[PDB]
Curated annotation (Swiss-Prot), chains A, B:
One function term, GO molecular function aspect: large ribosomal subunit rRNA binding
Organism this protein belongs to: Geobacillus stearothermophilus
Gene name of the record: rplN
Keyword set includes Transmembrane: no
Full protein name: Large ribosomal subunit protein uL14
Function of the molecule: Forms part of two intersubunit bridges in the 70S ribosome. Binds to 23S rRNA.
SMART domains: Ribosomal_L14
Similarity section: Belongs to the universal ribosomal protein uL14 family.
Length: 122, 122
């Protein structure tokens, strides 16, 4: 499960390439993140000369997980990687493009801009 | 995995309630069925007085499996049950209604009527 020190791929064009989880937001006791959760993380790798830099602390929403989610209709969806999108405090993405499919569960948590920018929603 | 003697729920209103797999169609050597495969089965349970009866042999396409499928985009989809739809030789469903979500993979195998009747395609 995604927890502190887990490495996440970045599914956007913000400049960040990989982040390392520091904590899962949402209250004392939260330890594991799944789709829709917001994490505080440090940028592990980034493209040089960009807006986001290595070592910087950012907030990111998880958009794909290997663990996946069980749905009300009996379906279960999972992905082949743990990925996130770097966001501002108002939940809007810092980048302008989202790469790869994202889970529809994001819609329930009000990540509307990400859902609109996503290539496909599953 | 779905194989000979596996019991499958019927996701249609044909009258059949559960079937028992006899064989997986597709050539010598085929043993396991997943979404899109066609099986020959015996009706195990059916509503009395209907068009389909207990003990009868039917052909059915698998529309939901607990095993699931890995997709080209990195997603993996599975369901909480193994279900099928009873079909005629031309792939058209014998019933007039399909219950529950069905996998989009059915589209590749030309099960167009089922895809159109499905409540939702995932």
């Amino acid at each position: 499960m995604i927890q502190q020190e887990s490495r996440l791929k970045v599914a956007d064009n913000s400049g960040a390439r990989e982040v390392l989880v520091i904590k899962v937001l949402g209250g004392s006791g939260r330890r594991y993140a799944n789709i829709g959760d917001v994490v505080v993380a440090t940028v592990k790798d980034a493209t040089p000369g960009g807006v986001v830099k290595k070592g910087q602390v950012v907030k990111a929403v998880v958009v794909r997980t290997k663990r996946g989610v069980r749905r009300p209709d009996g379906s279960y969806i999972r992905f082949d990687e743990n990925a996130c999108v770097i966001i501002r405090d108002d939940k809007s993405p810092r980048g302008t493009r989202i790469f790869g499919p994202v889970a529809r569960e994001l819609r329930d948590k009000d990540f509307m801009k990400i859902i609109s920018l996503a290539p496909e929603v599953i």
